Amino acid sequence: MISSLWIAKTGLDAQQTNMDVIANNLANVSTNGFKRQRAVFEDLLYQTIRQP
Amino acid sequence: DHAIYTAMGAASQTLNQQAVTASNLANASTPGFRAQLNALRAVPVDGLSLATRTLVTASTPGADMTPGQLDYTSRPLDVALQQDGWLVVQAADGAEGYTRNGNIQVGPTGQLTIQGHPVIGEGGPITVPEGSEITIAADGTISALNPGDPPNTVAPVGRLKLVKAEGNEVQRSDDGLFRLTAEAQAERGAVLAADPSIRIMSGVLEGSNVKPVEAMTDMIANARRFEMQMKVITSVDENEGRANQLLSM
Amino acid sequence: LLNIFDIAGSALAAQSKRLNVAASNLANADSVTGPDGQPYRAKQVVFQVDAAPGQATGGVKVASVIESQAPEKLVYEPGNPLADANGYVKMPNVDVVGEMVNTMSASRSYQANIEVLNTVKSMMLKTLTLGQ
Amino acid sequence: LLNIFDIAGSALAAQSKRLNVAASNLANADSVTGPDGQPYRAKQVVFQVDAAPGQATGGVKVASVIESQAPEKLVYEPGNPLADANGYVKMPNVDVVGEMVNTMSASRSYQANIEVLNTVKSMMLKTLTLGQ
């Protein structure tokens, strides 16, 4: 694994989790009292290599 | 012979630049994310005679300060900043980092926290009354109504400090939180004034500003550049090997 | 340094310097800036016939690496620093296909001179055994 | 051992060790953990000129294989052990292109030194028949 592969892996994972959240919301129409769930992501840490 | 290293440099740096775009690109749908633009620097190897070698180091001049795009979430305490504006947030180590992530949250103890390491405005970390029902105004004033009290009791409870600092005077700081470049500090000081001209639009979030077209073209160009370097590497290596026959006999 | 050895070794060095310049060009295409901050101007080598006194031929010298004075093709990015009035970045003038063929041709010339050296060296060693 | 044989044999051994380090790094990229539990720390060899007393030249020595303190790129898997607070595995910082090129360059240096050795062996054996 070079860094690009693993970073893109994480991006695809987050897209999959967002799609899961959307499908959970969207299947639960006609569910009494169900509150929609909004998935919020975040950047991981930045690793500096050469200071400006 | 050493030409191979120059080629390797480019190839290696190309992957690094790919890495940047990957992290730049995976963070679509991250609220407020400011895309990191990337560049390549020539590095001459100035020496005793016939300056021919230049290396190809990678670099990241900064973040693309094109404001992201808005999503009307109708949530009363989601905030979108105008162009060239920032929310101030206390960092984990303790300092005033800057963000454009407006997904403000209130904890059970009435503490305003964009994702933990909470927000700073007109004082310390802004704290609201426990029975929140929070609303945030156009210039930052935060007002609170306890849900079971007459709606003519909406007295303000805080002021969300806002900052104007754009582009070349702000740098990323190994978190999602920006800071000043340490050169825009023999300037507007280590802490900034509220700049009472930054507007706030509530009920709207802001997403990443990662242009997908520049990403796609960058990735195409990166792949081609890498494989051109690979051909140069093959040529240099096979030249050296098919040259080492000179020392025989 | 023996005379024909000098000729072919000069050829080897000149072809190697040409290939190194071509590699730098091919790697520094799409390089926004130099160290101080200026365009990366594509580089070329100048070949001259060596041995100024005598025979008017013999060997190649690659003195004076030069700067190809093409007009330095521009791009429009008026948010980047390094952009002038009417924001335009300087963006190296490197023609990648020409540089790829330059590398191929330099490698072929290198082959030719290497293998000329081998032939001549074998000839000299077999000359040493003249008579005995 | 002879003098020039020692020089070229030292070069051969040093290049072999450099290739070994390159192969170890190249095979241990994407290696989560070591025996005790620790990032695989990428390895490099330190080359020093040998023949410390006298003439300041001759041979190459590969003293003190060292370890690169480059920033040890992190990944996020907070279900794995080995992940600190803010779960971050350590995941070695081996540059694969760097090690491929190191392997090729080491092989070429190895060849040059082997073929030096063959030439010198021929020169000695032909020196024995000096005159007679």
Helix-strand blueprint:
This is part of a larger assembly, with one copy of chain A (52 residues), one copy of chain B (249 residues) and two copies of chain C (132 residues).
Chain A: H1 3-27
Chain B: H1 3-26, E1 36-40, E2 43-44, E3 54-55, E4 58-63, E5 70-72, E6 79-81, E7 85-90, E8 96-99, E9 105-106, E10 112-113, E11 134-136, E12 141-144, E13 156-159, E14 162-164, E15 170-172, E16 178-180, E17 200-202, E18 204-206, H2 212-243
Antiparallel strand pairs in B: 1-4, 2-3, 5-18, 6-17, 7-8, 7-14, 9-10, 11-12, 12-13, 15-16
Chain C: H1 3-28, E1 43-44, E2 48-49, E3 60-61, E4 66-67, H2 96-128
Antiparallel strand pairs in C: 1-4, 2-3
Helix pairs in contact in C: 1-2
Total number of β-strand segments of chain C?
A: 4
Biggest sheet details of chain A: none
Number of helices of chain C: 2
Helix vs. strand class of chain A: mainly alpha
Give the helix proportion of chain A (percent range): 40-55%
N-to-C SSE series of chain A?
H
* Largest interface pair: B-C, 40 and 41 residues
Name the assembly state.
Answer: part of a larger assembly
Number of helices of chain A: 1
The CA-CA distance between the termini of chain C, in Å, is: 26 Å
What is the H/E string of chain C?
A: HEEEEH
SS strand fraction of chain C: 5-15%
Instruction: Kindly name the structural category of chain C.
Output: mainly alpha
Largest sheet of chain C: 2 strands, antiparallel
How much is the radius of gyration of chain A in Å?
A: 17 Å
Total strand segments of chain A: 0
Helix content of chain C: 40-55%
- Can you tell me the overall shape of chain C? elongated
Rounded to the nearest angstrom, the distance between the terminal CA atoms of chain A is 28 Å
InterPro entries (chains C, D): Flag_bb_rod_N (IPR001444), Flagellar_basal_body_rod_CS (IPR019776), Flg_bb/hook_C_dom (IPR010930), FlgC (IPR006299)
Protein name (chains C, D): Flagellar basal-body rod protein FlgC
Main location (chains C, D): other
Family (chains C, D): Belongs to the flagella basal body rod proteins family.
